[PDB]
Amino acid sequence: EGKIDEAADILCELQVETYGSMEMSEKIQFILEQMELSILKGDYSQATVLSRKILKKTFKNPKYESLKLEYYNLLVKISLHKREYLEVAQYLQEIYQTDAIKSDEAKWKPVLSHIVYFLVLSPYGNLQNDLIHKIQNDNNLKKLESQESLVKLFTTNELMRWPIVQKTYEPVLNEDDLAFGGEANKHHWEDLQKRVIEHNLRVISEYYSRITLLRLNELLDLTESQTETYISDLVNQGIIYAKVNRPAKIVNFEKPKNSSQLLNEWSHNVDELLEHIETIGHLITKEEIMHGL
Amino acid sequence: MFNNHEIDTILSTLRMEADPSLHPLFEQFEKFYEEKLWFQLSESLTKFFDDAKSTPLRLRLYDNFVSKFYDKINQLSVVKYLLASLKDSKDFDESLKYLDDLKAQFQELDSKKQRNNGSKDHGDGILLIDSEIARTYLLKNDLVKARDLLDDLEKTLDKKDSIPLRITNSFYSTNSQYFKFKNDFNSFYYTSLLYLSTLEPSTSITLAERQQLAYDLSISALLGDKIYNFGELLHHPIMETIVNDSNYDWLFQLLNALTVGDFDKFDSLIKVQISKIPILAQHESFLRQKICLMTLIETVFVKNIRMLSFEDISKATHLPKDNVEHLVMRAISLGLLKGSIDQVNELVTISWVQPRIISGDQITKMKDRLVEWNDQVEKLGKKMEAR
């Protein structure tokens, strides 16, 4: 009828009274109905409280694969208003185990794929590694092989990569409704873009000691105004630092800048000369004997 | 010719008296299969020179001679030959049928006597099934099925002492085949090198096997690299009496091609289609940087210092100004470098740390460097000594 508030009011009183008794299945069911109504109102915070309670409930229960899936469907929706890839990623990780023992590869492979791909939008690549390393995630599965190749591609990125990625894949770039609530096609573009832009700076710092800004604006393929901003936000967060020398249009990534490094680097250098002298000493002595022979 | 009946029968008699062991329908039957200049057996020690050299429909008869062979000779010979002979003979359907026959038992338990692996020695009963199920299954069927067979082949390698070596042979040949089966000429180049390395110094070889390995190495070495594209194949047997067949001219053609960097030369290196792969389409840039890097590394400063002109890297590699920018960009990613090239200052200032090619101009360079390292030390010493 459209009386959202009225249906919720009656559902809220019911579930609370029932709690702690009258079947584990029955109680979890009311909570799914409730979150569905809650999300439309704006009641994301009420939805988070409901989420804590159900999460304990699904754990208690043995034989609860249906219950866990149902919780997942509710959980992703609330994260869509907020924006955490960590919430969705973690509870799905606990669903991985349950999907190997109980279910077919038909249930398991769309979930695995969605989870990694969720992490691809996610702007920091440091989660991504963890999920990819996985023993049955590095062997076989077509989608598995597509994600791992992307994982190598980021390492090497010089950000002429992104349109290559954008065109080449279209499933595994727009695929939803298979272990997640979905997300706009247009939202996938937004996220992917930010993630690459950051990762180009991130590699660029290691590989090259200096780059000029004119070259860098061309590499990202981007306007200076934006580049200055993408860089500015990153350095400020302190995942990395870089420094700009504005009248030169040169970006320093810096280099060693302290005595403490240099003393230890020196004592290393000695340590390598020494080791060479002993390896050379025994090695040469050996050479000699077999000249003899 | 008489030589199969002659050699088998006399040696068969010599190493046990007669007792159901002579076999005149064996003697005639093998006689029928191979009386050319190749023979189907040559008994006992002779089984290390003649054993099946054509499709061996004598097989059911030989199962009753495996059931005599142990007391006509030894341990090793039985496990050594009869699995490989079907495989070389291209008797794939037949190989499977014999693996059902043998399965895992040929004298185990309180028969005692230490067990090795097949295709060299008397094996692991289980290890024959495991190794050859992978060898056969790969040829037949898909890559996803292959990854799964390799994981089992890996379990069996791990689960043993390394002592008979035969099992390790099984691992390299098995594993090499997956990289052939896909596209992975670089991964295959590493695996083929290992396969040859633990094949040659212990013998046990077969003209069929060394034909695959030398030709397979030649295709893989063009098809992918990481170290350098031909210096390593001059400390790296490509035709040093492994076999010279199948036009090993290509190796020498490659070094000339690598230096000039002509497209015409790339087609005339091997033959058109097999030069391209499609492997070489990604490959030419990687291969390209390899020739440039080595040539400069020896030449520019006798000491070896990490100073290069950007210009002289372009001039030497023979590529345009943007292109080299992209190629170097990939090259730092690949490592064996680090220390931090400044892409403004036009200073290729990356640290010295890579391996140096061959025993030739390594030695020239070492003498110069030695006189200098020594001289430096001697000055310090002298001054200290005096006061």
Side-chain angles (χ1 to χ4, degrees), chain B residues 284-325:
Chain B
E284 182 177 1
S285 294
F286 286 109
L287 189 162
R288 177 62 67 190
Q289 185 64 51
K290 289 183 174 66
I291 295 297
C292 181
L293 178 62
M294 292 294 165
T295 298
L296 292 173
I297 292 168
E298 290 177 350
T299 299
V300 171
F301 299 109
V302 70
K303 289 189 289 185
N304 292 335
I305 295 170
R306 301 275 99 204
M307 182 178 71
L308 298 173
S309 176
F310 181 79
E311 290 177 350
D312 292 343
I313 292 168
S314 179
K315 182 177 179 180
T317 299
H318 300 292
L319 299 173
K321 290 180 180 178
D322 288 346
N323 287 341
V324 173
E325 290 177 350

Side-chain angles (χ1 to χ4, degrees), chain B residues 179-277:
Chain B
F179 287 142
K180 287 173 65 177
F181 287 135
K182 289 174 68 176
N183 64 340
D184 293 320
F185 285 86
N186 184 62
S187 294
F188 181 55
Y189 178 79
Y190 287 119
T191 299
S192 65
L193 178 61
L194 291 173
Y195 178 79
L196 181 60
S197 294
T198 60
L199 180 61
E200 182 179 89
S202 63
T203 188
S204 299
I205 63 171
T206 302
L207 291 173
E209 291 178 350
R210 292 176 64 86
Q211 184 66 55
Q212 290 175 343
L213 182 59
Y215 182 77
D216 288 346
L217 181 60
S218 294
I219 297 300
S220 65
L222 182 59
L223 272 55
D225 204 286
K226 290 172 65 288
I227 295 169
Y228 182 53
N229 292 288
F230 182 78
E232 294 296 313
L233 298 177
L234 298 176
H235 300 285
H236 186 283
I238 300 301
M239 58 182 291
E240 295 180 353
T241 76
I242 293 169
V243 62
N244 293 314
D245 290 347
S246 299
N247 296 308
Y248 290 130
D249 288 346
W250 287 348
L251 178 62
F252 182 74
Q253 292 296 306
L254 178 61
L255 181 60
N256 287 339
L258 292 173
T259 299
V260 173
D262 291 341
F263 287 105
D264 288 346
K265 182 66 176 178
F266 285 144
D267 288 346
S268 66
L269 189 162
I270 294 169
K271 64 186 294 183
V272 172
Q273 290 175 331
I274 293 169
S275 294
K276 290 179 180 178
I277 300 299

Side-chain angles (χ1 to χ4, degrees), chain A residues 139 158 160 208-210 212, chain B residues 329 340-345:
Chain A
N139 294 316
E158 296 181 357
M160 295 179 71
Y208 296 67
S209 179
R210 297 182 180 182
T212 63
Chain B
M329 291 174 69
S340 297
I341 191 169
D342 291 317
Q343 184 65 54
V344 61
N345 291 336

